[PDB]
């Protein structure tokens, strides 16, 4: 995030880090229950990767993190890599998260909900802070 | 230009698909939504994470970090997967697996 700010630790308890086996972070995602994560289809997650929940500071071990394993990957079959359209993927976890003070779920909307142009919303992540 | 060790957050406004088209034209599809153009931006490494708005008080998944400008320009809006247009697919999938 360019021009954002540090979060209060533990205040976005659905934010997860997706990592390879060496521990390199490549994408984010969101918990929606004890067994399922929502992410983007372009990230190319497979069953080799790890789901890391409950983490704040990637450079320090003053956290109680959960490393979760992926049972299967459901890519949207309308996903088009030329238009980057229908960019959604679901991850079913082979080991359930246990919900706590720093780990739990975001709400999903109804198809019918209306979020009006000009509403203030919020984004989170561990991406570049400058080009 | 490296990664922040600690989790970042930023506030930003939603656009209409009509205004977003003034920057991005025909790349904007029905399963997309834009936010930003307000002095902040998502950037490489944020892909697949959340954009959330309040509904009935609760934080609710409106977008998924998808794509945008190759220099992360804080003048240009960012593009996100529109969860409302994809949520019935989510439901089918959970239900059957």
């Amino acid at each position: 995030i360019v021009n954002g700010e540090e979060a209060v630790p533990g205040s976005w308890p659905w934010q997860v880090s997706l990592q390879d086996k060496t521990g390199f972070h490549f994408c984010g995602g969101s918990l929606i229950n004890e067994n399922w994560v929502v992410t983007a289809a372009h990230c190319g997650v497979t069953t080799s990767d790890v789901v890391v929940a409950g983490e704040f500071d990637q450079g320090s071990s003053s956290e109680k993190i959960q490393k979760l394993k992926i049972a299967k990957v459901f890519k949207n079959s309308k996903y088009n890599s030329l238009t980057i359209n229908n960019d959604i993927t679901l991850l079913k976890l082979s080991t359930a998260a246990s919900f706590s003070q720093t780990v739990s779920a975001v709400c999903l909307p109804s198809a019918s909900d209306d979020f009006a142009a000009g509403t203030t919303c919020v984004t989170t992540g561990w991406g570049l802070t400058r080009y | 230009a490296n990664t922040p060790d600690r989790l970042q957050q930023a506030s930003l406004p939603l656009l209409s698909n009509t205004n977003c088209k003034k920057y991005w034209g025909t790349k904007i599809k029905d399963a997309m939504i834009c936010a930003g153009a307000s002095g902040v931006s998502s950037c490489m490494g944020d892909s697949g994470g959340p954009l959330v708005c309040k509904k009935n008080g609760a934080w609710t998944l409106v977008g998924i970090v998808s794509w945008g400008s190759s220099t992360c320009s804080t003048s240009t809006p960012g593009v996100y997967a529109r969860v409302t247009a994809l949520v019935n697919w989510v439901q089918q999938t959970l239900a059957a697996n």
Binding site: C27, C43 | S70
Partner: peptide, 14 residues
């Protein structure tokens, strides 16, 4: 215009 991932061919600057 590119994907905001870190590793891969659709990602900005590879």
């Amino acid at each position: 215009a590119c994907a905001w991932c870190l590793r891969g061919t659709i990602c900005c600057s590879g």
